[PDB]
Amino acid sequence: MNIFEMLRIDEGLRLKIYKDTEGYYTIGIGHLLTKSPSLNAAKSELDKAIGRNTNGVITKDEAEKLFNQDVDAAVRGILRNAKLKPVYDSLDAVRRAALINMVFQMGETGVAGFTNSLRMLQAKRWDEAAVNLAKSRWYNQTPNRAKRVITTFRTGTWDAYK
Ligand SMILES: [Cl-]
Numbered sequence: 001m002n003i004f005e006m007l008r009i010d011e012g013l014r015l016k017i018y019k020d021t022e023g024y025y026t027i028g029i030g031h032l033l034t035k036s037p038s039l040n041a042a043k044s045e046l047d048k049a050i051g052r053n054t055n056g057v058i059t060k061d062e063a064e065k066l067f068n069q070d071v072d073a074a075v076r077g078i079l080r081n082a083k084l085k086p087v088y089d090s091l092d093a094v095r096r097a098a099l100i101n102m103v104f105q106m107g108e109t110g111v112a113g114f115t116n117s118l119r120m121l122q123a124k125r126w127d128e129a130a131v132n133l134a135k136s137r138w139y140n141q142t143p144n145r146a147k148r149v150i151t152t153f154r155t156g157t158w159d160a161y162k
């Protein structure tokens with residue numbers, strides 16, 4: 001198991017524009033297109049991202065390409081974030097994947113706000129962090145995915161994905 005496989009499981013794969021759990025237009029493997037309520041706006045962001053007139057549909061290769069870019073960007077965003085970096089640097093490989101997952105889903109700023117959880121993770125107080133992570137809108141809105149990521153931080157194994 002790895003970050004790619006992990007996110008592919010959490011996000012799924014869709015080749016036509018769709019609405020995410022928050023109602024935002026998305027495509028591929030969780031690639032958010034726009035928050036605007038307009039489908040045309042989403043189509044235009046899609047064409048711009050792909051480099052062609054897609055008409056709201058992309059191929060598998062194209063989805064994978066967006067996915068590679070998104071993963072790379074999340075990593076680099078963590079590495080650039082003063083609040084995230086030190087956490088990421090302190091963790092083992094499996095738990096780093098859990099942090100990347102959360103940034104991919106919620107954005108760097110979003111994650112940077114779990115101040116308290118971040119502090120516990122850095123301190124390696126696993127059970128405590130798991131408990132604090134659960135007291136969040138994130139956990140209440142997407143509980144199954146959240147539970148998977150949380151178990152990963154708690155245990156440091158990929159069991160929730162097996
Ligand atoms: Cl893009």
Ligand SMILES: [Cl-]
Pocket residue numbers: 141142143144145146
């Ligand atoms: Cl869920």
